Amino acid sequence: PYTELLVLKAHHDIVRFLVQLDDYRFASAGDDGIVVVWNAQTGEKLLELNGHTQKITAIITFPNQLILTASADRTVIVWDGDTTRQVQRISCFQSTVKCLTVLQRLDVWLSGGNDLCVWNRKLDLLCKTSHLSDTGISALVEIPANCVVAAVGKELIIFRLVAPTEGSLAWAILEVKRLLDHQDNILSLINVNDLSFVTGSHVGELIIWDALDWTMQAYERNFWDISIHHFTCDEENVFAAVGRGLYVYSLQMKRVIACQKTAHDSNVLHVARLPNRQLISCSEDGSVRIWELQLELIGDLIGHSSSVEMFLYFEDHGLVTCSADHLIILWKN
């Protein structure tokens, strides 16, 4: 259980994103276009970053550590963590940036909308696709050998990024493959352990891919048999929110191993495995449940009165949840 709880108040619209900054702080971001920095130990509100005029669509940290946010205002803003100063607003987009990702090795970060742009810390545009899609990149995930996988509707497009020769400043983006095996839009794209990545669609397709040669390994047209709303992964399992139920699929056995068909009174939104090996599920109605894997309901976390959009887990500071009810709740002990 988590007994004690703190209610952290600031947002005046749906809180969608939580992102850990360091060992004790995290940021939240909402449809109110506000970003807030919180102390996870004490629950103190540390900083507010105001500068977006519409909902935030993505937020990441760039390890001094920066915070980057994209918004339906068609900008990406880059924030200085310490001073809370706005380093730059980037507004050279004709469409909403939908995803942001860091390539650690190469020490760049990517924006994904109608096009893929490659950036460095100093905020130089190094390269960008032109007219990649009208659809928009819905997910970018790093895989080995400096490649990145982009979800574009039903398609996956794999790019390799090449740093310039010392002497030149010319980066290159090479398209290296397209995968066209989904009949439905790609909802989830996840790197499992740098050997596989997995994609899912809302209709219940699950595909496992080789992260090195980019070939199909396994395929399910409907891996659980109601739509799937979200997937996550550990080293060997996929945990899917499917209707009001949870399903656990083994990547090794290519089978559903565990199941709970009515885990909640409402659609399950998010389901994930914590480091400590417990499961957390989040629902439309506001309930959060903790499980141990048959699935045993350990904990019932009751407080939110509306969709729980995301959770964040600190080993030493407990559990954070955020909700369409404008609250963040920090659960402890």
Written as six digits, the tokens of 161 are 């990024």
Query: Which residue type does 62 have?
Result: F
Burial of 254: CB neighbours in 10 Å, binned 0-12, 13-18, 19+:
middle
C-alpha 87/C-alpha 68 separation (Å) is 10
DSSP state of 115: S
Q: Could you tell me which residues come within 8 angstroms of residue 167 by beta carbon, excluding any fewer than 6 positions away?
A: none
Angle at 234 between CA 287 and CA 213, to 5 degrees: 135
Query: Which residue type does 196 have?
Result: S
Q: What is the resolution of this structure in A?
A: 2.2
Closest among 183, 193, 115, 107 to 150, alpha carbons compared: 115
Strand order in the sheet with 5-8: 5-8, 328-331, 318-323, 308-314
Q: Are 13 and 31 in contact (CB under 8 A)?
A: yes
Cα 5 to the chain's mean position, in Å?
25
Written as six digits, the tokens of 254 are 């290519």
Query: Which residue type does 193 have?
Result: N
* Cα distances (Å, whole numbers) of residue 124 to 45, 170, 193, 260, 306: 32, 12, 31, 49, 41
DSSP codes joined into one string, 122-183: T--EEEE-SS--SS-EEEEEEETTTEEEEEETTEEEEEEEEPPPTT----EEEEEEEE---S
Q: Are 220 and 206 in contact (CB under 8 A)?
A: yes
* Cα distances (Å, whole numbers) of residue 142 to 4, 190, 239: 38, 9, 21
C-alpha 8/C-alpha 213 separation (Å) is 46
* Cα distances (Å, whole numbers) of residue 229 to 188, 203, 204, 232: 9, 9, 9, 11
Token pair 């009810």 is found at 325
Query: Which residue type does 208 have?
Result: I
Pairing of strands 245-250, 237-242: antiparallel
C-alpha 300/C-alpha 290 separation (Å) is 6
What are the φ/ψ torsions at residue 158 (nearest 5 degrees)? -105, 125
C-alpha 322/C-alpha 331 separation (Å) is 11
- Solved with: X-ray
Q: Are 286 and 267 in contact (CB under 8 A)?
A: no
Number of C-beta neighbours around residue 156 at 10 A: 24
